[PDB]
Amino acid sequence: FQKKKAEVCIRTSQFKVNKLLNRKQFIVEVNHPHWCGTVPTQLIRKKLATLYKVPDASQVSLFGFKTKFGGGKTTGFGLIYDDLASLKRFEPNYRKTRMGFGKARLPARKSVKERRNRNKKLRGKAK
Amino acid sequence: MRNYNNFNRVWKAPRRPFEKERLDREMKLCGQYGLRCKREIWRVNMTLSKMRRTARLLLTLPENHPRRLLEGSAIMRRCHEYGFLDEEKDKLDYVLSLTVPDILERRLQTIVFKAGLAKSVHHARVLIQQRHIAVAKQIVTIPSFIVRVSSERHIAFADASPFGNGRPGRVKRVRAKAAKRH
Amino acid sequence: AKKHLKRLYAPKDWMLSKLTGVFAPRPRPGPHKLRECLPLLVIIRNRLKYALNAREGEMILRQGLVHVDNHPRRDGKYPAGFMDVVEIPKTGDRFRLMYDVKGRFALVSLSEAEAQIKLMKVVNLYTATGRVPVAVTHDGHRIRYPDPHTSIGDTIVYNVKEKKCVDLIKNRQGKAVIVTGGANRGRIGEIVKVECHPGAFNIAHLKDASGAEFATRAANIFVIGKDLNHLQVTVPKQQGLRMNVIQEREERLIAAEARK
RNA sequence: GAUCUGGUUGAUUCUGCCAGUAGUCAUAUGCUUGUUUCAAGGACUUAGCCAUGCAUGCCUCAGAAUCACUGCAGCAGGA
RNA sequence: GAUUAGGGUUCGAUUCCGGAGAGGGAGCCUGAGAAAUAGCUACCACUUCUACGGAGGGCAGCAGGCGCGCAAAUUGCCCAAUGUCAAAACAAAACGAUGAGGCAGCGAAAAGAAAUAGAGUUUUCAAUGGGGGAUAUUUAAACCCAUCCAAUAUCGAGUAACAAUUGGAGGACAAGUCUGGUGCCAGCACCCGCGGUAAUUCCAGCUCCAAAAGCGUAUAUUA
RNA sequence: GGGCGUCCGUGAUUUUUUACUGUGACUAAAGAAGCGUGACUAAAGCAGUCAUGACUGAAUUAGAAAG
Ligand SMILES: [Mg+2]
Ligand SMILES: [Mg+2]
Ligand SMILES: [Mg+2]
Ligand SMILES: [Mg+2]
Ligand SMILES: [Mg+2]
Ligand SMILES: [Mg+2]
């Protein structure tokens, strides 16, 4: 054993440019020996930003990772769009909400179900 | 309810549960290979029984038949791959001569005893299950892991284990905390 | 009126995994049969990975970005089947639906000149109102004034841009077919002898390029050229030649060992 | 694995059943249960009876807006 | 599906396909398609609100409730995925509906993998889970699992008390001519048989055997 | 300009089936058999594997009688 600062190196396996939806899609595997815990998605986002030279580091989209048994590495899917305005357009709301910017959650669906059943009786401008 | 994930049984209990000849052989096999229960022997029975049954069907089939050239070269391939048969044994009549200790020698509990990484076969089963042995820089925590022939070269201590190049384990580390408060 | 497919009752050539959801996209009526098509949601999501789910998949289709036979198809459930030409102008790739020799659908990449024509087999002939004799095709087309030598078993070359039947291929002894049904589906062969048996199914005997003899029903054969060299359309990478199951099993082990 | 074994007699050969035995994605029950993975789950009796909530609704650039609705300075959202 | 050398013998309410039904029984309208039932009309059997004039009900949908039984869970979260519908791509003041379907809670039905220790000279040395937790990761959101006890800097086994049980020890059938008690009693025993004051069989203590996170028993059913 | 011999459809001429058996043609998945593949092993699953993208894989076989 020899103590050194825990280094993250990052690798992209099967890369694809998607001219539809305006993005570059791929799976990204992170090797993190001597790391403590799991690498955060935010820290993978900036290091994948430098490797592809994207102008804004927040236009990278990184969702579900699966850490390998035994440790040492993770592997998840990656998305980098041509524009950040294209990111807010084509990403789902749940991946936007995990990036901060996104629509706040609707009222609980059990409430909107009951109100809509109450309005089935009415006719005028009351509903 | 609409779930189509499959599952079957891997072992079978013997007919005649009290045979004094059988009960003596299986206590030797639990001692010479460090086994938890008789059920780990009984799946090695069913693993080898299924090989002994398919290879006995293929000998009913003639040579230069399609189901014997294909799928008879598959069962000789997995014996050579997992160390069940050495490379001279290529005639398919040697699968009918395989024994239960021929399969039990290929478990990761046995090779870690035979390669020399542990003093006893009960030392090997502890060190597998306590995350010390990596087969191909892959920490394997399963004692019934059947080691291939090509995997024998690369069994070593894990790179994250305290016995390898990892951080020191619990009894040193909780002692290193007690010497720190003083 | 069925509106649902279960993913187990879906065709096996689509290759949808049984553990991902109960349902499969039931293809609408249209050109091709439900048992014998590949709907555009499976092509855009499962064949091509342009879409990760069905929600990204209708962002492509409803926007008007996939063209099946020169016309944009905004339906994820549109039945695309055999001999169809799927263009995409943005990614600049265009494909043809062919059967490969294992019977599955295969996307054969095309040029611009090869992507204008398609080959279509007559299924019925009748006279419409007026005295116009129209030809009914397996892709649902109704060509109104076909070549007067058109019979039912024949093949019309069509050119989907300028909707003009440019050619005809008769169904005779000396022609080469592709088999589009049965155990022999995807195989290409010369025609040897066609056994008539009126009142029942015509049987067609066929010989392959290697010399392998095999038979089908003559409603399953689809004539695609004058001979096996002069095929009118390009075929997948095996070119209708079915290798042995032992020999093709040996070659993958040899290729996997030689790769490492 | 194309396998049986106790029980009729003072002992012996049989016939023949009872009994053991091993399965069940076959149910129920009893005593126990530290970790994980994968799962069935009011079918059987009563297609018996049902409190309450919910389970089928749809709007785009592209059918109909004078809300006495909303911003904005007629254009947009629209119940 | 279960079992099966071969021939067979059984089970199939249940996920896929088809048929039928929506409390029983009819009869219809509308529509391309219904003899539709989270459509209508009527009667029969039950049934809820009423200001007595009247008005309604249909869980063999999903949760639940009472009964019935030997016998079967949450009045849970969500459309993120799979799909269906449709005037409908996503986004922009600007999120279509879905008890279909997922997800989680209960869950020893049945299946996989697997701890309860190792190593050495009375006496020490190492281990790492169960379990606590995170810069976090998963996830629609959590959960789980996976990864981690510094990366400058993360808690922890000793009777490891963090403690294995369930059935047996005459025979079949593996394993006591051990000790105490009772005395054809109490009980055991699938069958044969035990027990009548020295019980290989009961009630117990010890010690063993078998399977083991399992193991008895009962009823079906195959060998 | 004759012979030879085919193809297709139509007329006229006096009749032999069935079981069996060999080959075919058609015959949904899930399930069974099994070919690949270190999901850590396995029960699984159809996936993945390798140094601004490459070779892609999902092989195959049994499935009652009748037609
Ligand atoms: Mg560790
Ligand atoms: Mg049904
Ligand atoms: Mg009645
Ligand atoms: Mg219910
Ligand atoms: Mg005594
Ligand atoms: Mg006793």
Side-chain angles (χ1 to χ4, degrees), chain A residues 1-6 8-114 116-127, chain B residues 1-87 89-152 154-164 166-182, chain C residues 1-12 14-74 76-111 113 115-138 140-194 196-206 208-212 214-215 217-225 228-256 258-260:
Chain A
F1 179 72
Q2 58 90 29
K3 177 179 178 294
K4 66 183 293 296
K5 184 173 74 69
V8 169
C9 66
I10 187 167
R11 188 175 180 86
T12 293
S13 177
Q14 51 186 354
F15 184 78
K16 184 174 176 65
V17 174
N18 196 359
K19 295 290 182 68
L20 313 178
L21 300 169
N22 297 113
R23 68 186 183 181
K24 293 180 181 178
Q25 68 184 2
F26 55 90
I27 60 171
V28 57
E29 60 268 14
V30 176
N31 298 113
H32 55 86
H34 206 222
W35 188 262
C36 295
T38 61
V39 180
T41 302
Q42 182 176 359
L43 190 149
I44 302 168
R45 184 175 296 118
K46 66 178 178 65
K47 292 180 96 291
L48 187 62
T50 63
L51 190 148
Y52 284 97
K53 281 78 177 175
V54 303
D56 189 77
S58 64
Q59 71 185 1
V60 178
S61 179
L62 294 171
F63 58 95
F65 290 92
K66 299 296 182 182
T67 66
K68 184 68 176 177
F69 184 79
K73 66 182 290 292
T74 67
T75 299
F77 197 86
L79 291 169
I80 295 169
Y81 299 14
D82 292 332
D83 293 329
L84 180 143
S86 179
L87 185 142
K88 298 183 190 293
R89 186 176 178 88
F90 297 109
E91 285 290 325
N93 197 6
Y94 74 98
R95 289 201 293 270
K96 289 173 72 175
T97 303
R98 292 187 292 179
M99 295 179 187
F101 52 90
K103 292 185 284 187
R105 188 68 183 270
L106 291 175
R109 196 186 71 184
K110 188 180 291 294
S111 66
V112 69
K113 289 167 79 70
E114 289 183 350
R116 188 177 64 243
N117 287 114
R118 288 196 295 268
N119 289 322
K120 289 181 182 178
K121 296 180 176 67
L122 280 70
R123 180 173 172 82
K125 64 173 70 176
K127 62 182 286 185
Chain B
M1 185 183 75
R2 288 178 177 88
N3 194 353
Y4 302 100
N5 192 0
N6 191 0
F7 60 95
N8 292 115
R9 298 184 68 249
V10 302
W11 63 275
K12 191 185 287 185
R15 304 293 301 270
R16 309 157 112 87
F18 310 115
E19 293 294 326
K20 187 66 181 295
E21 184 179 1
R22 181 186 60 82
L23 291 170
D24 291 334
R25 289 189 289 111
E26 292 179 352
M27 185 62 75
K28 293 184 177 70
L29 292 174
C30 291
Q32 294 179 357
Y33 296 99
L35 296 175
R36 186 181 67 246
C37 63
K38 298 291 179 69
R39 180 173 60 239
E40 292 182 353
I41 297 170
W42 292 347
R43 64 176 181 266
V44 178
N45 286 321
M46 180 178 280
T47 296
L48 186 144
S49 177
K50 293 182 186 293
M51 291 188 285
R52 193 181 65 241
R53 289 181 186 275
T54 62
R56 191 173 64 242
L57 182 65
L58 298 176
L59 298 171
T60 301
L61 295 172
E63 185 61 29
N64 298 117
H65 184 74
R67 189 177 287 176
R68 184 175 175 177
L69 269 67
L70 181 62
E71 197 269 327
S73 66
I75 186 62
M76 296 307 292
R77 187 263 181 92
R78 81 183 74 256
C79 290
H80 294 170
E81 187 177 3
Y82 289 102
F84 292 159
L85 290 173
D86 290 329
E87 294 292 329
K89 284 90 170 65
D90 56 354
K91 195 179 75 173
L92 181 58
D93 294 336
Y94 297 99
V95 181
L96 281 301
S97 67
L98 291 175
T99 62
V100 172
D102 290 331
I103 309 299
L104 292 170
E105 288 289 329
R106 304 303 298 162
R107 298 173 68 249
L108 186 66
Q109 184 176 358
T110 301
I111 286 96
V112 174
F113 175 70
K114 295 294 188 291
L117 281 72
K119 268 70 68 180
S120 66
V121 72
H122 299 84
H123 189 199
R125 189 176 177 92
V126 171
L127 264 57
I128 296 167
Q129 190 67 38
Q130 293 180 357
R131 301 190 68 184
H132 291 97
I133 290 94
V135 171
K137 277 76 69 179
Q138 175 62 254
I139 295 170
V140 176
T141 64
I142 304 301
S144 67
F145 188 86
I146 298 297
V147 177
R148 297 176 185 174
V149 177
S150 66
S151 296
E152 289 178 351
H154 298 90
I155 294 170
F157 290 102
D159 200 2
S161 66
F163 295 160
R167 294 178 181 90
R170 189 186 301 179
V171 64
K172 291 183 181 179
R173 177 177 57 82
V174 304
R175 186 176 65 241
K177 299 293 183 290
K180 186 64 65 67
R181 276 83 58 87
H182 293 85
Chain C
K2 279 89 172 64
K3 292 183 179 181
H4 294 274
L5 288 175
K6 302 293 177 68
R7 185 174 285 263
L8 271 65
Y9 187 64
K12 185 67 175 178
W14 296 359
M15 295 180 286
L16 297 173
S17 176
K18 64 182 178 180
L19 293 178
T20 305
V22 179
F23 295 99
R26 183 181 179 91
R28 291 188 184 275
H32 295 286
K33 294 204 166 28
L34 193 151
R35 294 285 94 190
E36 295 181 354
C37 68
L38 186 62
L40 270 67
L41 185 61
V42 180
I43 295 170
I44 298 302
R45 182 182 65 192
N46 292 112
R47 296 286 182 179
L48 305 174
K49 282 89 174 66
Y50 287 157
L52 299 177
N53 54 5
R55 185 256 190 182
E56 300 295 329
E58 69 177 0
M59 294 179 184
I60 296 167
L61 291 168
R62 299 285 292 166
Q63 193 181 1
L65 266 57
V66 178
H67 298 178
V68 176
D69 290 331
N70 202 7
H71 189 194
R73 306 297 183 187
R74 329 213 142 146
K77 301 192 290 182
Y78 179 77
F82 182 70
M83 289 293 174
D84 289 330
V85 178
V86 174
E87 298 90 2
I88 298 169
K90 287 177 94 289
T91 62
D93 53 352
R94 78 277 290 158
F95 294 101
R96 185 182 294 274
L97 272 296
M98 295 296 290
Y99 294 109
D100 62 357
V101 70
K102 293 180 183 179
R104 297 173 292 172
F105 285 103
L107 294 170
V108 175
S109 296
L110 297 173
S111 64
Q116 294 184 358
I117 57 94
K118 69 181 290 185
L119 278 71
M120 301 192 300
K121 185 170 74 70
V122 179
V123 175
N124 196 3
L125 285 170
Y126 68 94
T127 298
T129 186
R131 189 184 172 182
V132 47
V134 313
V136 179
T137 284
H138 74 281
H141 284 83
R142 288 182 286 170
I143 288 93
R144 283 177 58 85
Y145 289 102
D147 195 358
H149 297 288
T150 302
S151 297
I152 290 177
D154 298 332
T155 291
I156 293 171
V157 183
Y158 186 69
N159 192 357
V160 300
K161 287 181 68 176
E162 53 178 0
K163 295 181 180 181
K164 300 291 185 181
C165 297
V166 299
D167 197 358
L168 180 63
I169 304 165
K170 295 295 291 296
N171 190 358
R172 292 179 66 87
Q173 300 294 322
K175 270 74 176 176
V177 299
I178 185 168
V179 178
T180 61
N184 300 116
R185 182 176 66 189
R187 297 180 69 184
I188 297 170
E190 186 72 25
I191 300 170
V192 173
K193 189 261 184 181
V194 179
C196 187
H197 313 295
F201 297 97
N202 302 320
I203 301 299
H205 295 90
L206 301 175
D208 195 357
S210 66
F214 63 98
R217 294 182 180 179
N220 286 320
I221 62 171
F222 191 92
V223 54
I224 57 171
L228 280 78
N229 297 114
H230 296 88
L231 295 177
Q232 297 290 321
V233 69
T234 183
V235 295
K237 62 183 182 180
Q238 282 69 237
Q239 294 180 355
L241 296 174
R242 180 176 289 172
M243 276 62 255
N244 294 114
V245 67
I246 300 169
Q247 188 268 327
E248 191 271 333
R249 186 262 187 191
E250 293 292 329
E251 180 64 27
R252 293 187 181 275
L253 272 64
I254 295 169
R259 189 174 62 84
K260 64 183 179 180

